[PDB]
Design a protein around this ligand. Structure first.
Ligand code: NLQ
Ligand code: MG
Ligand code: MG
Lengths: 360, 370
């Protein structure tokens, strides 16, 4: 039945990397259970527009007062109770995603299962930064191929793109290879990006501006390598517009950027209706976010590998009791209700910068 | 010569609002006025934030923006020396969005720079009108022969365009009422961002009421649906929320998403970018008009100066200050007569903070130095 949101905690952690990362968490309490979600907004707006200070002020001053004490039928009803406000999708996603976890836990049912997924494991890829030269790129690719990753992504930039890609594909004729172009190109670079075409990249990720679709559509007329959109798809209607315009043929789907699981499933279904795949993007999540990501990724149109690689690659020690470790390019879905993971409250306390509790 | 920003003050004020301003996204009765003052070369520049405490008109918030100013933009400029505002704007870096926040810095920089030269702001932006045409934007009304109360009052004052705020389902009513009680005025609506393509049939109804345009009928972040809606109806569409940069304006116009842009200086990142938006629109043969954000006289003055550029060919929302506040934060009156608002004289914005009055309605203040 229906669920009442009785209380909420905001906990900001400073989690040591394997030098630190600020992890904002929301915990929603109701019906004897709790839901947890992780904010992916940063202190300054670098990947996208939101910030921790804007987001938390929005939570504590607006979203939380709107839902505390109220009774809801499902997470969609929780989101609807916030809906006047414009943008701020990552802030919204904190509430929406904690709601999904809480709801799922009142039912005793895994999150992915309620979203309609039925994979027990999800394929994972790996992201490589810019290396000093070709052979150094190939060596690191060769390592990750031997570890069993199912997709290799190379970071590229003007002056360093065809070379790493050429050297890599020469050494690995059949692997799934992609590049992250990190909005560093313009339409003048069309001829240079077109030189990648002979290397059969599965896609080039967001080569032009972060909030553009229109110029992406033009670039896609000039090269044959498929484009993948990231920051410019923040909703199902964006997804529709991107695919119908021919802005790309693949979507990097990040649950929090689009406002949470319900809207993420909509992006996923829109893309599928165009027969375009999505894959799960990553944002250096602690185990809370990683676990939400893994559950979302069990949906059937996540047909390319996702950035939900091992937590040990990022954190000396994670915020959850359960280890999220990929083996042979496969990450298992964590067992249990909701996300299937559990905050380690004592460890969390040792790295808590700040916390607060709100009631009705 | 170059200028050095030696210090910066953030001053947050609150002013009561004379009329109740409904709109499709809420109802507003007060206004928070975040001010930025930059100090250098013995003068100061002042600009006013147009972000709200909660993201209702658009995505930015006061808390987010002030935090961004104090933690990032101000540190990046304080103690630095610049050739022009463009250089200041370039020193803020590569952060994404947050145009209104940037605009506080950029517009204050323009005022400061204008004041070092002793030249009016408008003049330095290329404008040479000495007064600007203005209309009024009215909030949500009551019926066919009693919505005209608020409109009668404004036509008697000579406002050059009347703009009715609307929403579902309060649109063809309020307009019908107004248009035969007053069959000849330039009339428009602010469909304010509330409809979808589903409602196209409802909006083609407005075509028989002879509007200059329908403002932002569909989603605040959309251009593609607008382009489609424009094919289906004869009334020009005006974009507001959807155009936050010059490249946005180019994409909107190339797509045919609108034929008119409501240019809000702060929404697009400040004066330089507004000049660019202005010039892109003109190159497509589309006019702009100056939008409003319930500004104190600091923001209203900046708007009047920008409005002196030549593609501001439709009346703006820059109505008389005394409509809004019992008392403004500046010493000078900014009052239109017969739909004409004169350009306030002096260097930069040509207006001046009334520091004593501002202190009685300040709720926050901080000073930042190198
Ligand atoms: C936020 C927005 O609704 N404000 C008014 C501006 C007119 C007046 N408010 O200055 C507008 O019509 O744009
Ligand atoms: Mg990527
Ligand atoms: Mg408006």
């Amino acid at each position: 039945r229906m669920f009442k949101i009785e209380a909420a905690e905001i906990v900001v952690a400073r989690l040591p990397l394997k030098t630190h990362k600020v992890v904002p968490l929301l915990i929603l309490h109701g019906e004897g259970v709790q839901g947890v979600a992780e904010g992916t907004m940063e202190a300054r707006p670098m990947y996208r527009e939101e910030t921790i200070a804007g987001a938390l002020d929005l939570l504590r001053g607006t979203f939380l007062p709107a839902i505390l004490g109220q009774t809801f039928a499902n997470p969609e009803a929780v989101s609807d109770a916030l809906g006047s406000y414009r943008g701020n999708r990552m802030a919204r996603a904190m509430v929406e995603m904690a709601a999904w976890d809480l709801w799922a836990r009142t039912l005793g049912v895994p999150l992915g299962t309620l979203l309609g997924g039925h994979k027990e494991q999800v394929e994972v890829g790996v992201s490589l930064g810019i290396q000093a030269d070709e052979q150094a790129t190939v060596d690191l690719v060769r390592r990750h191929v031997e570890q069993g990753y199912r997709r290799i992504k190379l970071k590229i930039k003007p002056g360093w793109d065809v070379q790493p890609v050429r050297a890599t594909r020469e050494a690995f004729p059949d692997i799934r290879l992609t590049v992250d172009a990190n909005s560093a190109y313009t339409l003048a670079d069309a001829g240079r990006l077109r030189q990648l075409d002979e290397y059969d990249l599965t896609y080039i990720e967001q080569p032009l501006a972060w909030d553009d679709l229109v110029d992406h559509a033009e670039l896609a007329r000039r090269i044959r390598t498929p484009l993948c959109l990231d920051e410019s798809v923040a909703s199902a209607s964006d997804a529709r517009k991107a695919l119908a315009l021919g802005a790309g043929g693949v979507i990097n789907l990040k649950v929090a950027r689009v406002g949470g699981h319900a809207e993420s499933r909509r992006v996923h279904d829109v893309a599928q209706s165009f027969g375009a795949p999505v894959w799960c993007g990553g944002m250096l999540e602690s185990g809370i976010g990683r676990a939400h990501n893994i559950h979302l990724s069990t949906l059937s149109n996540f047909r390319l590998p996702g950035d939900t690689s091992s937590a040990s690659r990022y954190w000396e020690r994670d915020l959850i009791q359960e280890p999220l470790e990929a083996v042979d390019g496969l990450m298992p879905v964590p067992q249990g209700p909701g996300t299937g993971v559990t905050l380690d409250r004592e460890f969390l306390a040792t790295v808590t910068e700040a916390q607060e509790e709100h009631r009705a």
